[PDB]
Design a protein around this ligand. Structure first.
Ligand SMILES: O=C(CN1Cc2ccc(-c3nc(NC4CCOCC4)ncc3Cl)cc2C1=O)N[C@H](CO)c1ccccc1
Length: 345
């Protein structure tokens, strides 16, 4: 078999001429020539069966992405694994190959207002579909937005995604959380388990802000520093928004802080389109109940040149699947079952 940077890449006969793309905790990714469709593809090798939480992510990723079909959501084209559970140590997930991601693009490229508008439109168009399936992405960030050579955008990495559960969203103050720090909504640190659609809109707000300046808007250096940054720009919460936080630890923390005034968006972003800043403000609302929803965001005047609800599809039914209690050994079985459709047969 072909190897790349040490690892065996058992992807043939269909996929040949591998080039290394990158690596992480997930595994390793290469481009490969697909000998059926005659295009290069992305292939990521995942080796998760020795820890339950890698199994969870892999299964969430697989189940969600096979059910979803949308232009602004990365699909799964093919999955390669051994023919038996016993022999299955790796899963190879085949996906459309994208030129870059919004993280890499933001470190080197100034975005025109027309690019920001188009990228924001596509994020929200994909997110409309996600939310319509009652799913929360929960880790939206520049590196999870893939881009092709014509700036078409696809949301990727559904391994932290959850079915929405707003009746069980409440928790205590400083309750530990998994998703990416700079894009975490203020309520995560105060009283939310991150089980409502509003968590994703916050992350989109952060991404909008970052597109306007090429710098993260709330670059907290650790867990409660993240609220420090947030409140440094939004200013102190209003009496009404505070009264919505019934948890006493969280409310009294907020009351203990000196009063801070709102930094106006147009001084933080002096060159930004004023409509973009109005939408930003509505996505970066402190109170999650008052935060704009995806369909409202799409209908915002900033996006008028693209808004077309008949061309912003929704999912055919809500998604349902839970996984926290299931062992490593059951999750292997489910990944095996979920990938069977791709086997010769
Ligand atoms: O799978 C992932 C996360 N990842 C990693 C990755 C790498 C590359 C591409 C990708 N990249 C490109 N092009 C690139 C060209 C170079 O510039 C950048 C873009 N084109 C297409 C794709 Cl799909 C996509 C992904 C993705 O979704 N994590 C699973 C589930 O959470 C997981 C499972 C178990 C434990 C931990 C995590």
């Amino acid at each position: 078999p072909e190897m790349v940077r040490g690892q065996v890449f058992d992807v043939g006969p269909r996929y040949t001429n591998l080039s290394y793309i990158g690596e992480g905790a997930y595994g390793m990714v290469c481009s490969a020539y697909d000998n059926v469709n005659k295009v290069r593809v992305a292939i990521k090798k995942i080796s998760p069966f020795e820890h339950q939480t890698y199994c969870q992510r892999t299964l969430r990723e697989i189940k969600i992405l096979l059910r979803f079909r949308h232009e602004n959501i990365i699909g799964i084209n093919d999955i390669i694994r051994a023919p038996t559970i016993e022999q299955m140590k790796d899963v190879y997930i085949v996906q459309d190959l994208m030129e870059t991601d919004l993280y890499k693009l933001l470190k080197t490229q100034h975005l025109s207002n027309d690019h920001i508008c188009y990228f924001l439109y596509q994020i929200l168009r994909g997110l409309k579909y996600i939310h319509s399936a009652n799913v929360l992405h929960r880790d939206l960030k520049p590196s999870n937005l893939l881009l092709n050579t014509t700036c078409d955008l696809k949301i990727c990495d559904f391994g932290l995604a959850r079915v929405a559960d707003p009746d069980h969203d409440h928790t205590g103050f400083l309750t530990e959380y998994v998703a990416t720090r700079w894009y975490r909504a203020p309520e995560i640190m105060l009283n939310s388990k991150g089980y409502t659609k509003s968590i994703d809109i916050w992350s989109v707000g952060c991404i909008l802000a970052e597109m306007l300046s090429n710098r993260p808007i709330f670059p907290g250096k650790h867990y409660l520093d993240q609220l420090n940054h947030i409140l440094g720009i939004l200013g102190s919460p209003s009496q009404e928004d505070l009264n919505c936080i019934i948890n006493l630890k969280a409310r009294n923390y907020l009351l203990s802080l000196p009063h801070k005034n709102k930094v106006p968006w147009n001084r933080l972003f002096p060159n930004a389109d004023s409509k973009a800043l109005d939408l930003l403000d509505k996505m970066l609302t402190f109170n999650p109940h008052k935060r704009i929803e995806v369909e409202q965001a799409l209908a915002h005047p900033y996006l008028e040149q693209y808004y077309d609800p008949s061309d912003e599809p929704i999912a055919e039914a809500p998604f349902k699947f839970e996984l926290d209690d299931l062992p490593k050994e059951k999750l292997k079985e489910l990944i095996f079952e979920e990938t069977a459709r791709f086997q010769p047969g």
